[PDB]
Design a protein around this nucleic acid. Structure first.
Lengths: 191, 136, 52
RNA sequence: GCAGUCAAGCGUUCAUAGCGACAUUGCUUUUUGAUUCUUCGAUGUCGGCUCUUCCUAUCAUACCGAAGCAGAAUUCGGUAAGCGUUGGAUUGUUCACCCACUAAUAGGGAACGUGAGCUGGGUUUAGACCGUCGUGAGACAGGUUAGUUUUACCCUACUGAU
Protein backbone atom coordinates (compact mmCIF):
# COMPACT_ATOMS: atom_id res chain seq x y z
CA UNK A 1 0.00 0.00 0.00
CA UNK A 2 3.29 1.96 -0.18
CA UNK A 3 3.10 3.49 3.30
CA UNK A 4 4.33 7.08 3.16
CA UNK A 5 6.01 6.99 6.60
CA UNK A 6 6.14 4.69 9.62
CA UNK A 7 7.94 5.43 12.88
CA UNK A 8 9.04 3.85 16.15
CA UNK A 9 10.49 5.51 19.26
CA UNK A 10 13.49 4.04 21.08
CA UNK A 11 13.96 5.04 24.72
CA UNK A 12 17.56 5.32 25.94
CA UNK A 13 18.11 4.81 29.69
CA UNK A 14 20.52 7.22 31.36
CA UNK A 15 22.90 4.38 32.27
CA UNK A 16 23.84 3.53 28.67
CA UNK A 17 24.57 5.34 25.42
CA UNK A 18 24.08 4.30 21.79
CA UNK A 19 26.23 5.28 18.81
CA UNK A 20 24.87 5.49 15.25
CA UNK A 21 27.00 5.49 12.09
CA UNK A 22 24.96 5.10 8.89
CA UNK A 23 23.48 1.68 9.70
CA UNK A 24 26.07 0.47 12.23
CA UNK A 25 24.81 0.60 15.81
CA UNK A 26 26.86 0.29 19.01
CA UNK A 27 25.65 0.49 22.61
CA UNK A 28 27.90 1.32 25.56
CA UNK A 29 26.76 0.42 29.06
CA UNK A 30 27.89 -0.68 32.52
CA UNK A 31 27.61 -4.37 31.62
CA UNK A 32 29.59 -4.07 28.39
CA UNK A 33 29.44 -3.01 24.75
CA UNK A 34 27.76 -4.68 21.77
CA UNK A 35 27.73 -3.73 18.09
CA UNK A 36 25.38 -4.89 15.34
CA UNK A 37 25.36 -4.20 11.60
CA UNK A 38 21.90 -3.35 10.24
CA UNK A 39 22.79 -2.58 6.62
CA UNK A 40 20.63 -5.48 5.37
CA UNK A 41 17.29 -3.85 6.25
CA UNK A 42 17.53 -0.30 4.77
CA UNK A 43 16.07 1.71 7.65
CA UNK A 44 16.61 5.34 8.68
CA UNK A 45 17.61 6.68 12.10
CA UNK A 46 17.32 10.09 13.75
CA UNK A 47 18.30 11.54 17.13
CA UNK A 48 15.94 14.19 18.54
CA UNK A 49 16.04 14.27 22.38
CA UNK A 50 19.20 12.28 23.22
CA UNK A 51 17.14 9.69 25.12
CA UNK A 52 14.82 9.28 22.10
CA UNK A 53 15.91 7.80 18.76
CA UNK A 54 13.32 7.70 15.98
CA UNK A 55 13.36 5.10 13.20
CA UNK A 56 11.66 6.00 9.93
CA UNK A 57 10.96 4.47 6.52
CA UNK A 58 9.73 6.50 3.55
CA UNK A 59 7.65 4.93 0.76
CA UNK A 60 8.04 1.41 2.14
CA UNK A 61 5.74 -1.48 1.36
CA UNK A 62 3.87 -3.71 3.78
CA UNK A 63 6.63 -6.32 3.90
CA UNK A 64 9.34 -3.68 4.32
CA UNK A 65 7.35 -1.89 7.04
CA UNK A 66 7.18 -5.20 8.91
CA UNK A 67 10.99 -5.00 9.03
CA UNK A 68 10.79 -1.50 10.56
CA UNK A 69 9.34 -2.79 13.83
CA UNK A 70 11.84 -5.66 14.13
CA UNK A 71 14.68 -3.12 13.83
CA UNK A 72 13.32 -1.38 16.93
CA UNK A 73 12.75 -4.75 18.60
CA UNK A 74 16.33 -5.98 18.24
CA UNK A 75 17.83 -2.60 19.18
CA UNK A 76 15.61 -2.32 22.25
CA UNK A 77 16.15 -6.01 23.05
CA UNK A 78 19.93 -5.53 23.18
CA UNK A 79 19.47 -2.29 25.15
CA UNK A 80 18.26 -4.43 28.04
CA UNK A 81 21.14 -6.79 27.26
CA UNK A 82 23.70 -4.06 27.90
CA UNK A 83 21.61 -2.52 30.71
CA UNK A 84 20.06 -5.48 32.54
CA UNK A 85 21.68 -8.57 31.02
CA UNK A 86 20.03 -11.85 30.07
CA UNK A 87 19.77 -15.05 32.12
CA UNK A 88 18.26 -18.25 30.68
CA UNK A 89 17.62 -21.24 32.95
CA UNK A 90 17.35 -24.87 31.85
CA UNK A 91 16.14 -27.93 33.73
CA UNK A 92 17.22 -31.52 33.21
CA UNK A 93 14.43 -34.01 32.48
CA UNK A 94 15.05 -37.75 32.71
CA UNK A 95 13.20 -40.93 33.64
CA UNK A 96 15.80 -43.56 34.56
CA UNK A 97 19.20 -42.27 33.42
CA UNK A 98 20.65 -39.26 35.28
CA UNK A 99 22.23 -36.69 32.96
CA UNK A 100 25.65 -35.25 33.81
CA UNK A 101 26.31 -31.77 32.39
CA UNK A 102 29.59 -29.98 33.08
CA UNK A 103 31.89 -27.33 31.60
CA UNK A 104 35.18 -28.54 30.11
CA UNK A 105 37.95 -26.40 28.60
CA UNK A 106 39.82 -28.07 25.73
CA UNK A 107 42.37 -25.72 24.11
CA UNK A 108 40.27 -22.72 25.10
CA UNK A 109 37.00 -23.97 23.60
CA UNK A 110 34.69 -23.87 26.66
CA UNK A 111 32.83 -27.03 25.66
CA UNK A 112 29.70 -28.05 27.57
CA UNK A 113 30.01 -31.79 28.20
CA UNK A 114 26.89 -33.98 28.39
CA UNK A 115 27.32 -37.49 29.77
CA UNK A 116 25.01 -40.48 30.26
CA UNK A 117 22.11 -38.91 28.37
CA UNK A 118 19.67 -41.78 27.72
CA UNK A 119 22.57 -44.06 28.64
CA UNK A 120 24.35 -43.05 25.43
CA UNK A 121 28.08 -43.77 25.44
CA UNK A 122 28.68 -41.02 22.86
CA UNK A 123 29.88 -37.70 24.26
CA UNK A 124 28.14 -34.41 23.49
CA UNK A 125 30.02 -31.10 23.48
CA UNK A 126 28.51 -27.66 22.89
CA UNK A 127 30.77 -24.59 22.50
CA UNK A 128 30.28 -21.52 24.67
CA UNK A 129 30.19 -18.34 22.60
CA UNK A 130 31.72 -14.95 23.38
CA UNK A 131 30.15 -12.90 26.16
CA UNK A 132 28.03 -15.76 27.55
CA UNK A 133 28.80 -17.55 30.82
CA UNK A 134 27.21 -20.67 32.31
CA UNK A 135 26.49 -21.15 36.02
CA UNK A 136 24.63 -23.66 38.18
CA UNK A 137 21.45 -22.93 40.11
CA UNK A 138 21.63 -22.55 43.88
CA UNK A 139 20.18 -25.36 46.05
CA UNK A 140 18.04 -26.63 43.14
CA UNK A 141 18.97 -29.99 41.64
CA UNK A 142 19.78 -30.31 37.93
CA UNK A 143 19.30 -26.73 36.73
CA UNK A 144 21.88 -24.88 34.63
CA UNK A 145 21.88 -21.09 34.20
CA UNK A 146 23.17 -19.34 31.07
CA UNK A 147 24.30 -15.79 31.91
CA UNK A 148 25.24 -13.49 29.04
CA UNK A 149 25.15 -9.87 27.94
CA UNK A 150 23.92 -10.62 24.40
CA UNK A 151 20.51 -11.49 22.96
CA UNK A 152 21.11 -13.82 20.01
CA UNK A 153 24.41 -15.24 21.28
CA UNK A 154 22.88 -16.37 24.58
CA UNK A 155 19.61 -17.59 23.05
CA UNK A 156 21.32 -19.46 20.21
CA UNK A 157 23.75 -21.05 22.67
CA UNK A 158 20.67 -21.88 24.75
CA UNK A 159 18.94 -23.60 21.82
CA UNK A 160 22.17 -25.33 20.77
CA UNK A 161 22.38 -27.14 24.11
CA UNK A 162 18.68 -28.06 23.89
CA UNK A 163 19.00 -29.47 20.37
CA UNK A 164 22.16 -31.44 21.17
CA UNK A 165 19.99 -33.72 23.34
CA UNK A 166 17.63 -35.46 20.94
CA UNK A 167 16.00 -38.90 20.87
CA UNK A 168 16.84 -41.12 17.89
CA UNK A 169 14.35 -43.71 16.57
CA UNK A 170 12.02 -43.70 19.59
CA UNK A 171 8.64 -42.32 20.63
CA UNK A 172 8.96 -38.61 21.41
CA UNK A 173 5.65 -38.47 23.29
CA UNK A 174 6.85 -41.20 25.71
CA UNK A 175 10.54 -40.43 26.34
CA UNK A 176 10.15 -36.88 27.65
CA UNK A 177 13.77 -36.70 28.80
CA UNK A 178 16.35 -34.23 27.52
CA UNK A 179 16.95 -30.54 28.25
CA UNK A 180 14.56 -27.62 27.79
CA UNK A 181 14.17 -23.90 28.44
CA UNK A 182 12.57 -23.27 31.85
CA UNK A 183 12.66 -19.49 32.32
CA UNK A 184 13.68 -16.56 30.11
CA UNK A 185 14.89 -14.03 32.68
CA UNK A 186 17.31 -11.14 33.07
CA UNK A 187 20.64 -10.90 34.86
CA UNK A 188 19.34 -8.20 37.22
CA UNK A 189 17.56 -9.97 40.07
CA UNK A 190 15.21 -7.04 40.71
CA UNK A 191 14.43 -6.64 36.99
CA UNK B 1 28.83 -66.12 9.77
CA UNK B 2 25.07 -65.75 10.14
CA UNK B 3 22.73 -65.67 13.10
CA UNK B 4 24.15 -67.42 16.15
CA UNK B 5 27.71 -67.41 14.75
CA UNK B 6 29.33 -65.43 17.55
CA UNK B 7 32.72 -63.93 16.82
CA UNK B 8 34.21 -63.32 13.39
CA UNK B 9 36.11 -65.39 10.83
CA UNK B 10 39.00 -64.28 8.63
CA UNK B 11 38.24 -64.67 4.93
CA UNK B 12 39.60 -67.77 3.19
CA UNK B 13 39.46 -69.27 -0.28
CA UNK B 14 35.96 -70.10 -1.54
CA UNK B 15 35.98 -73.67 -2.82
CA UNK B 16 32.38 -74.88 -2.48
CA UNK B 17 29.94 -73.21 -4.90
CA UNK B 18 26.23 -73.94 -5.22
CA UNK B 19 25.78 -77.53 -6.38
CA UNK B 20 28.69 -79.21 -4.60
CA UNK B 21 28.51 -82.63 -2.94
CA UNK B 22 30.03 -83.03 0.52
CA UNK B 23 30.69 -86.16 2.56
CA UNK B 24 28.62 -86.50 5.72
CA UNK B 25 31.04 -85.97 8.61
CA UNK B 26 28.66 -86.64 11.52
CA UNK B 27 26.67 -89.70 12.60
CA UNK B 28 23.29 -88.38 11.47
CA UNK B 29 22.69 -91.29 9.08
CA UNK B 30 23.27 -89.23 5.93
CA UNK B 31 25.95 -90.07 3.37
CA UNK B 32 26.32 -86.85 1.35
CA UNK B 33 25.02 -83.28 1.23
CA UNK B 34 24.09 -81.10 -1.75
CA UNK B 35 24.77 -77.40 -1.17
CA UNK B 36 21.97 -75.15 -2.45
CA UNK B 37 23.05 -71.76 -1.04
CA UNK B 38 25.38 -70.08 1.45
CA UNK B 39 24.60 -67.58 4.20
CA UNK B 40 25.77 -63.98 3.96
CA UNK B 41 26.59 -64.18 0.25
CA UNK B 42 26.87 -61.35 -2.28
CA UNK B 43 24.93 -60.25 -5.34
CA UNK B 44 26.71 -60.44 -8.70
CA UNK B 45 25.46 -61.58 -12.10
CA UNK B 46 26.58 -65.13 -12.92
CA UNK B 47 28.38 -65.89 -9.66
CA UNK B 48 27.71 -69.06 -7.70
CA UNK B 49 27.45 -68.28 -3.96
CA UNK B 50 30.35 -70.30 -2.60
CA UNK B 51 31.10 -71.75 0.83
CA UNK B 52 34.26 -72.25 2.87
CA UNK B 53 35.55 -73.70 6.13
CA UNK B 54 33.44 -72.97 9.20
CA UNK B 55 30.62 -71.51 7.10
CA UNK B 56 27.03 -72.63 7.65
CA UNK B 57 24.97 -73.65 4.62
CA UNK B 58 21.75 -75.54 3.92
CA UNK B 59 22.13 -78.77 1.96
CA UNK B 60 19.73 -81.57 1.06
CA UNK B 61 20.67 -85.24 1.40
CA UNK B 62 20.72 -86.69 -2.11
CA UNK B 63 21.72 -90.12 -0.71
CA UNK B 64 20.88 -91.17 2.84
CA UNK B 65 18.43 -92.60 5.30
CA UNK B 66 14.99 -91.82 3.91
CA UNK B 67 13.22 -89.09 5.89
CA UNK B 68 16.37 -86.94 5.76
CA UNK B 69 15.55 -86.40 2.06
CA UNK B 70 13.15 -84.23 0.04
CA UNK B 71 13.66 -81.28 2.40
CA UNK B 72 16.11 -78.46 3.13
CA UNK B 73 18.27 -78.56 6.26
CA UNK B 74 21.19 -76.33 7.32
CA UNK B 75 24.70 -77.67 7.81
CA UNK B 76 28.17 -76.51 8.85
CA UNK B 77 31.37 -77.07 6.87
CA UNK B 78 34.15 -78.91 8.71
CA UNK B 79 36.53 -79.64 5.80
CA UNK B 80 37.29 -77.76 2.59
CA UNK B 81 39.88 -79.81 0.63
CA UNK B 82 40.90 -76.50 -1.00
CA UNK B 83 44.16 -74.68 -0.29
CA UNK B 84 43.52 -71.64 1.91
CA UNK B 85 46.03 -69.32 3.55
CA UNK B 86 46.06 -68.72 7.30
CA UNK B 87 47.39 -65.53 8.87
CA UNK B 88 50.33 -67.47 10.34
CA UNK B 89 51.56 -68.12 6.79
CA UNK B 90 50.52 -71.68 5.93
CA UNK B 91 48.74 -72.91 2.79
CA UNK B 92 46.86 -76.01 3.95
CA UNK B 93 44.02 -78.19 2.73
CA UNK B 94 42.17 -81.38 3.64
CA UNK B 95 41.73 -84.68 1.83
CA UNK B 96 38.01 -84.31 1.06
CA UNK B 97 34.94 -82.20 1.74
CA UNK B 98 32.86 -82.84 4.85
CA UNK B 99 29.87 -81.23 6.51
CA UNK B 100 27.81 -81.71 9.65
CA UNK B 101 24.05 -81.39 10.12
CA UNK B 102 22.99 -78.41 12.23
CA UNK B 103 19.76 -76.51 12.82
CA UNK B 104 19.87 -72.70 12.41
CA UNK B 105 20.35 -72.10 16.15
CA UNK B 106 23.80 -73.69 15.72
CA UNK B 107 23.64 -77.00 17.58
CA UNK B 108 24.11 -80.38 15.90
CA UNK B 109 21.54 -83.10 15.31
CA UNK B 110 24.33 -85.69 15.33
CA UNK B 111 26.31 -87.07 18.26
CA UNK B 112 29.92 -87.46 17.07
CA UNK B 113 32.19 -86.40 14.21
CA UNK B 114 34.56 -88.67 12.29
CA UNK B 115 37.80 -87.30 10.89
CA UNK B 116 39.76 -84.07 11.34
CA UNK B 117 37.83 -80.84 11.94
CA UNK B 118 39.28 -77.46 10.98
CA UNK B 119 39.83 -75.23 14.01
CA UNK B 120 38.52 -72.31 11.95
CA UNK B 121 35.18 -74.13 12.33
CA UNK B 122 35.63 -75.17 15.96
CA UNK B 123 36.42 -71.61 17.06
CA UNK B 124 33.59 -69.95 15.12
CA UNK B 125 30.92 -72.48 16.11
CA UNK B 126 31.13 -73.50 19.80
CA UNK B 127 28.76 -76.46 19.52
CA UNK B 128 30.72 -77.91 16.60
CA UNK B 129 33.82 -77.84 18.79
CA UNK B 130 31.71 -79.40 21.55
CA UNK B 131 30.99 -82.42 19.33
CA UNK B 132 34.23 -82.24 17.32
CA UNK B 133 36.90 -84.92 17.15
CA UNK B 134 40.37 -84.32 15.73
CA UNK B 135 41.10 -80.59 15.67
CA UNK B 136 43.39 -80.00 12.68
CA UNK C 1 10.70 -40.99 39.46
CA UNK C 2 8.12 -39.10 37.40
CA UNK C 3 8.15 -35.54 38.86
CA UNK C 4 5.27 -34.30 36.66
CA UNK C 5 6.21 -30.67 37.37
CA UNK C 6 8.74 -30.81 34.51
CA UNK C 7 6.54 -33.08 32.37
CA UNK C 8 4.31 -30.11 31.58
CA UNK C 9 7.56 -28.31 30.65
CA UNK C 10 9.13 -31.18 28.70
CA UNK C 11 5.87 -31.83 26.84
CA UNK C 12 5.63 -28.10 26.05
CA UNK C 13 8.07 -28.59 23.16
CA UNK C 14 7.36 -32.25 22.30
CA UNK C 15 3.58 -32.87 22.36
CA UNK C 16 1.81 -29.51 22.64
CA UNK C 17 1.98 -28.84 18.89
CA UNK C 18 -0.10 -29.16 15.72
CA UNK C 19 0.55 -31.15 12.53
CA UNK C 20 -0.44 -30.37 8.96
CA UNK C 21 -2.09 -33.48 7.55
CA UNK C 22 -0.56 -33.23 4.07
CA UNK C 23 3.09 -32.44 4.81
CA UNK C 24 3.22 -34.03 8.31
CA UNK C 25 5.24 -31.20 9.87
CA UNK C 26 5.36 -29.84 13.41
CA UNK C 27 3.51 -26.53 13.82
CA UNK C 28 2.80 -24.27 16.79
CA UNK C 29 -0.47 -25.11 18.57
CA UNK C 30 -2.01 -21.72 17.70
CA UNK C 31 -0.72 -21.57 14.12
CA UNK C 32 -3.41 -20.91 11.53
CA UNK C 33 -1.39 -22.11 8.51
CA UNK C 34 1.69 -24.18 7.70
CA UNK C 35 5.00 -22.37 7.22
CA UNK C 36 6.33 -24.85 4.64
CA UNK C 37 5.79 -24.42 0.90
CA UNK C 38 5.54 -28.03 -0.29
CA UNK C 39 2.10 -28.35 1.30
CA UNK C 40 1.18 -24.83 0.20
CA UNK C 41 0.44 -22.97 3.46
CA UNK C 42 -2.56 -25.16 4.21
CA UNK C 43 -5.49 -24.23 6.44
CA UNK C 44 -6.20 -27.65 7.96
CA UNK C 45 -3.92 -28.78 10.79
CA UNK C 46 -4.43 -31.71 13.07
CA UNK C 47 -3.46 -31.56 16.75
CA UNK C 48 -0.75 -33.98 17.82
CA UNK C 49 -2.30 -37.11 19.29
CA UNK C 50 -1.81 -37.52 23.03
CA UNK C 51 -0.24 -40.56 24.69
CA UNK C 52 -2.40 -43.70 24.92
C1' G D 1 -1.05 -47.68 -15.24
C1' C D 2 -0.41 -43.40 -12.00
C1' A D 3 -1.73 -38.84 -9.00
C1' G D 4 -5.42 -35.42 -6.55
C1' U D 5 -9.91 -32.77 -4.58
C1' C D 6 -14.80 -33.41 -2.01
C1' A D 7 -16.78 -36.57 1.38
C1' A D 8 -21.34 -40.29 3.71
C1' G D 9 -19.11 -43.92 6.52
C1' C D 10 -15.12 -47.93 8.58
C1' G D 11 -11.65 -47.41 12.01
C1' U D 12 -14.58 -49.52 20.20
C1' U D 13 -15.80 -44.29 21.31
C1' C D 14 -13.10 -40.05 16.12
C1' A D 15 -13.65 -37.72 8.64
C1' U D 16 -9.04 -37.84 7.10
C1' A D 17 -3.21 -42.80 12.42
C1' G D 18 -4.60 -45.68 8.35
C1' C D 19 -8.75 -46.42 4.85
C1' G D 20 -12.78 -44.73 2.38
C1' A D 21 -18.43 -45.20 -0.94
C1' C D 22 -21.53 -41.77 -4.81
C1' A D 23 -19.32 -38.37 -7.97
C1' U D 24 -15.24 -35.47 -10.09
C1' U D 25 -9.97 -33.15 -12.08
C1' G D 26 -5.58 -34.48 -14.44
C1' C D 27 -0.76 -37.04 -15.56
C1' U D 28 1.89 -41.03 -18.18
C1' U D 29 3.49 -43.15 -23.71
C1' U D 30 6.96 -49.30 -21.02
C1' U D 31 -0.31 -52.19 -22.18
C1' U D 32 -3.75 -52.62 -25.75
C1' G D 33 -6.48 -50.00 -29.24
C1' A D 34 -7.71 -46.40 -33.47
C1' U D 35 -5.39 -43.64 -37.50
C1' U D 36 -2.34 -44.68 -41.67
C1' C D 37 1.71 -39.81 -42.32
C1' U D 38 7.41 -41.99 -43.55
C1' U D 39 9.46 -46.72 -45.77
C1' C D 40 7.23 -52.49 -50.21
C1' G D 41 14.34 -50.44 -56.64
C1' A D 42 13.50 -53.66 -50.15
C1' U D 43 16.13 -49.27 -42.66
C1' G D 44 17.12 -57.85 -41.05
C1' U D 45 11.07 -59.72 -37.40
C1' C D 46 10.46 -62.71 -30.84
C1' G D 47 13.47 -64.12 -27.08
C1' G D 48 18.11 -65.23 -24.40
C1' C D 49 23.83 -63.98 -23.39
C1' U D 50 27.28 -59.29 -23.18
C1' C D 51 27.66 -54.08 -22.25
C1' U D 52 27.00 -48.53 -21.44
C1' U D 53 24.19 -44.59 -20.03
C1' C D 54 19.82 -42.12 -18.69
C1' C D 55 14.68 -41.28 -15.84
C1' U D 56 12.04 -41.96 -11.59
C1' A D 57 6.08 -42.68 -9.70
C1' U D 58 12.68 -45.20 -3.80
C1' C D 59 12.84 -51.94 -3.17
C1' A D 60 17.40 -51.49 0.22
C1' U D 61 21.18 -47.90 2.15
C1' A D 62 21.72 -41.72 4.27
C1' C D 63 19.08 -37.88 7.17
C1' C D 64 14.07 -36.56 9.08
C1' G D 65 8.62 -35.97 10.18
C1' A D 66 3.31 -38.92 11.71
C1' A D 67 0.72 -43.07 14.11
C1' G D 68 -4.74 -46.28 17.19
C1' C D 69 4.79 -45.27 17.25
C1' A D 70 5.46 -47.79 25.59
C1' G D 71 10.30 -51.18 23.32
C1' A D 72 10.71 -54.60 18.90
C1' A D 73 8.39 -55.07 14.51
C1' U D 74 5.39 -52.15 11.23
C1' U D 75 2.67 -48.52 8.49
C1' C D 76 2.25 -43.25 5.88
C1' G D 77 5.18 -39.20 3.98
C1' G D 78 9.74 -35.39 2.62
C1' U D 79 15.16 -34.19 0.08
C1' A D 80 17.11 -37.68 -2.49
C1' A D 81 19.31 -42.53 -7.65
C1' G D 82 25.20 -41.20 -5.04
C1' C D 83 25.35 -46.53 -4.59
C1' G D 84 23.26 -51.63 -4.82
C1' U D 85 18.96 -54.61 -6.95
C1' U D 86 20.98 -62.07 -7.01
C1' G D 87 21.65 -67.55 -7.72
C1' G D 88 18.33 -71.81 -9.64
C1' A D 89 14.12 -75.81 -11.20
C1' U D 90 9.76 -75.36 -15.71
C1' U D 91 8.95 -73.01 -20.29
C1' G D 92 11.76 -70.39 -26.71
C1' U D 93 9.55 -67.88 -23.84
C1' U D 94 7.69 -61.60 -22.94
C1' C D 95 4.96 -63.05 -18.92
C1' A D 96 4.10 -66.29 -14.79
C1' C D 97 4.71 -69.71 -10.49
C1' C D 98 7.91 -71.80 -6.96
C1' C D 99 13.16 -73.03 -4.15
C1' A D 100 17.00 -70.03 -1.61
C1' C D 101 20.15 -66.26 -0.14
C1' U D 102 20.26 -61.21 0.86
C1' A D 103 19.99 -54.75 3.30
C1' A D 104 16.73 -55.42 -1.14
C1' U D 105 15.74 -58.91 -4.72
C1' A D 106 11.76 -51.41 -7.54
C1' G D 107 9.72 -50.04 -12.15
C1' G D 108 11.43 -48.52 -16.75
C1' G D 109 13.62 -45.84 -21.70
C1' A D 110 17.54 -45.45 -25.35
C1' A D 111 14.43 -47.67 -33.69
C1' C D 112 9.21 -52.50 -28.04
C1' G D 113 18.62 -50.25 -26.80
C1' U D 114 21.86 -54.11 -28.52
C1' G D 115 22.35 -60.20 -35.12
C1' A D 116 28.61 -56.49 -40.64
C1' G D 117 28.12 -58.34 -31.14
C1' C D 118 26.63 -63.83 -30.56
C1' U D 119 22.62 -68.12 -30.60
C1' G D 120 18.68 -69.91 -33.89
C1' G D 121 15.18 -72.28 -29.01
C1' G D 122 9.94 -69.94 -31.50
C1' U D 123 7.16 -67.77 -35.16
C1' U D 124 7.91 -67.81 -40.96
C1' U D 125 9.39 -70.88 -47.63
C1' A D 126 10.38 -75.67 -49.34
C1' G D 127 10.37 -82.57 -46.62
C1' A D 128 7.09 -85.29 -43.44
C1' C D 129 3.27 -87.18 -39.40
C1' C D 130 -1.73 -86.81 -36.50
C1' G D 131 -6.79 -84.43 -35.60
C1' U D 132 -10.94 -81.31 -37.84
C1' C D 133 -12.82 -79.33 -42.56
C1' G D 134 -13.20 -80.21 -48.25
C1' U D 135 -15.61 -84.93 -53.27
C1' G D 136 -10.96 -83.14 -54.47
C1' A D 137 -6.09 -80.17 -55.20
C1' G D 138 -5.64 -78.30 -50.40
C1' A D 139 -6.98 -74.94 -45.38
C1' C D 140 -6.21 -74.62 -39.83
C1' A D 141 -3.42 -68.48 -33.64
C1' G D 142 -3.99 -76.40 -34.46
C1' G D 143 0.03 -80.26 -32.11
C1' U D 144 5.34 -82.42 -33.57
C1' U D 145 10.17 -83.44 -36.01
C1' A D 146 14.52 -81.56 -39.71
C1' G D 147 15.51 -77.18 -41.57
C1' U D 148 22.92 -72.90 -45.77
C1' U D 149 21.92 -66.70 -41.73
C1' U D 150 27.32 -63.22 -45.82
C1' U D 151 31.07 -58.27 -46.33
C1' A D 152 34.33 -53.26 -43.15
C1' C D 153 40.79 -53.24 -46.89
C1' C D 154 36.11 -46.66 -46.26
C1' C D 155 34.34 -41.78 -43.22
C1' U D 156 32.90 -40.22 -38.53
C1' A D 157 32.52 -41.72 -33.25
C1' C D 158 35.35 -44.27 -29.49
C1' U D 159 40.09 -46.85 -27.51
C1' G D 160 45.64 -46.19 -27.68
C1' A D 161 50.24 -43.91 -30.71
C1' U D 162 53.31 -40.41 -33.62
Amino acid sequence: MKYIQTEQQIEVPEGVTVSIKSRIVKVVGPRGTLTKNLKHIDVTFTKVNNQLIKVAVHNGGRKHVAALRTVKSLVDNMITGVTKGYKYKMRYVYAHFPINVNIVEKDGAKFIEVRNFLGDKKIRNVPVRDGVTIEFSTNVKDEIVLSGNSVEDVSQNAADLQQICRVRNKDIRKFLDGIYVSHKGFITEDL
Amino acid sequence: SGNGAQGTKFRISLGLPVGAIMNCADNSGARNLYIIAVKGSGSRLNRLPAASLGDMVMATVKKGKPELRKKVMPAIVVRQAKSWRRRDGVFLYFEDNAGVIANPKGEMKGSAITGPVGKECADLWPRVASNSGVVV
Amino acid sequence: IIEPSLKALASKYNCDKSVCRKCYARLPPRATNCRKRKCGHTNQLRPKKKLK
